[PDB]
Structures are given as structure tokens and as C-alpha cells.
Amino acid sequence: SINDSKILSLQNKKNTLMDTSGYNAEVRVEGNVQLNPIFPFDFKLGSSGDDRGKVIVTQNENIVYNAMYESFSISFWIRINKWVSNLPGYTIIDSVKNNSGWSIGIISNFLVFTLKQNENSEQDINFSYDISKNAAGYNKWFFVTITTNMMGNMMIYINGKLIDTIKVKLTGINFSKTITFQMNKIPSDNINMWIRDFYIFAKELDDKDINILFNSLQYTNVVKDYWGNDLRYDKEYYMINVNYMNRYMSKKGNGIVFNTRKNNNDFNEGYKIIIKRIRGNTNDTRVRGENVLYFNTTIDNKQYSLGMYKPSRNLGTDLVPLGALDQPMDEIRKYGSFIIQPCNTFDYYASQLFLSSNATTNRLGILSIGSYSFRLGGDWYRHEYLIPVIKIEHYASLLESTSTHWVFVPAS
């Protein structure tokens, strides 16, 4: 397909960063550079120590490396940890030789790709993440795709979505044969960076192009946690609804209630849930596509599993509340299991959960969310409780509702 246009393929093979395009670029790793042994085999970089990691990719004098003067695209999965709003300027991927070439940096909540024509002239497009939607920082994995046409346009994409574009100005420039991955601070406080699958194509990839590459680099059937990593079973998490990201889980009576977080910059409140497998792959602990599973939570020091309970009063038709119950394994089998389904969007890594019939893939309803006025626990009067509620047997209306999207943030 388009793989032909590749002239750089910085991947980790056998615990060793190398070029796999077939052009044999020189890849040197200096300092503290950590390589991930499992998928996505990313390499971690820091901005802390006197020996903070560094990766140097040097392209020989090959001719193919000149298709860069016409059309060329850059793509790579990247993750910046604790990429907070007031982050100070940094350079992460520099490819400027003598005030010429290209560079990639992050300032506050901006990801900027620059194109230095010379020590003076130089353009740049960017991506600035919606801060209001990322209080705890934009710390999730996101795919970047920068397409540059020296006679055409200079565009930047995020998770296959076009975010910015500008007309390339027609002065002369000179691209370098060296790219350096390192977090150099422009002239907690330590931030980390994970890079994975760094490509440079000798053509302008188009929207269609970009997205086929975007998906091909993912195991889309594998549900992902909030930060874009693989969701795993037997691991603690804070479960949260996309529409109520400022809420944490608590307990009242049988119900799980959602209360407003006191900490809006971190996830460290309320009870955690542990996902248990029933039906799925046994090679690993990764939560997949149509896995049947259930939810465990430890409240006081007692163990519960999320399950349906009879409400103090009829809250609505085909509406039955989800709470923390202490039930036997066979009761969970009949109506306490869920069929998960990955559900990702540009904004977040989530999932939809369908009530399972007898621990099978047969769906009986969808897990949504709502606020109801009723009695819980030992209440004398009714109260306003925001609860996770299941829409049983007629939920075609919620299938496209963002209120059915749930994320998992590792409570590690």
C-alpha cells in the first residue's frame, strides 16, 4: 500500500531501537532510555537527570532522503506524563542542523511542529488540547501525523483528525540527516515521554492514508484504560462515566453513589473496582472485545461485586440501579456479569458495558447513568443520588449516548 513511501521506521526489536525501513539509519541510545519489552514496545524518555535519555537517528547520505524536499509525512504514537496546562517549553524531537530543518516541541498545552527555513524565516502549526477536559493533565497516548508539502500545505493530525493547516511559504530550506529524541528544556517537576513507531514517509499522506495507518497500529479489540494503555483484569481502577468525570464512587445502602471530587487535578478518591474475567483470552490479563466479566470492589474491608438491587421506589421503566452487593458466584452468573465493548473517540478511551444473560454474550441491557430522588440505606426522606443505572431490555436509545461511556483510571 503506502508502506512503499517509508524511509524511516524507528521501532524496538529484540530490546534494541533500530530502523526497519530497510535503509539502515544509525540509531544510538545514550543515557537513561527505557525500552518496553511488551506491546507497544515504546521507549521512555525523561527530563530529569544529568543523563536523561537520548536517542539519535542518523540517516546516511542516501538519495531517497531527499524526497523530503517535495512531500513527506511524520507519524508516531506519543505520551507525555503529567503534560499539565502550565508546562514550560520543551523540545522533544529536534531535526534542525544549522538553523534549518524541522523540530517538534511542547509549550503549555501545545504540541508544535516547526519548519525552520533559516535562522529567520520559519513556520509552524500545532495542537493545543482542550484544557477544561483534561484537568489531571493530557496524560494519555495520542497518535500524531504531520504531513508537509514543500509546494503545498503543512498540516498536523491528532488520532487521524485534522487539527491545523497552513500554506507552506516558496523560500529555500535544507533538511538535516539527524533527528534527536530528547527532552531539552527551552532556556513534581520531572516529566516523562514514551515514543512508539516513529515513521517518516516520502509522500504527503492524505486523510484516508493517515487513518488506515492510525488503526493498523492498534489492537482495537483490546479495551484501553483512560491513558490509552491496555485495560487489564485483576487490577485496581477508579471507574468513571464520561459525562461525570468530576465524580468518584461511594456507598450508601446497597447503592453506589457518585460524589463530587475534592481533588480536581488527580484521581485519588473513593472506592476502586477490580475487573474479573469470566470469558476471554487466557494468554494474558488484557480485557478484550466481547469478554464477559464482572466487577469487584472493597468498601470497608469487606468484598462486594457490583450488581442490581431493588430501588426504594420505581425510578423509571426498565431502569434498575447498580450497587455494591455481597452476592454468591451463581447470582453474579445470572445477572451480575457484563459484556464489555471498546468505545474510543478523539476525546477519550472508554467502553460500553452491557448486562449479560447468564455470563454469556447475550445482552439484556446497557449500563448508563442517572440522577434520581429516592431513599437509600436508612434514609427517612428521599435524596438526590447520582447513580449508575442499567437500562434493561429496551436500551436502543442509549446506545449512542455518551452517558454509556465508562473509563478506567488505574488507581495503581
Automatic annotation (TrEMBL):
Keyword Metal-binding appears in the UniProt entry: yes
Primary subcellular site in the record, as a coarse category: host cell
One Gene Ontology term, aspect cellular component: host cell cytoplasmic vesicle
Keywords: Disulfide bond, Host cell membrane, Host cytoplasm, Host cytoplasmic vesicle, Host membrane, Host synapse, Hydrolase, Membrane, Metal-binding, Metalloprotease, Neurotoxin, Protease, Secreted, Toxin, Virulence, Zinc
Disulfide bond recorded as keyword: yes
Any one GO biological process: proteolysis
Protein name from the UniProt record: Neurotoxin
Residues of the full protein shown: 863 to 1284 of 1285
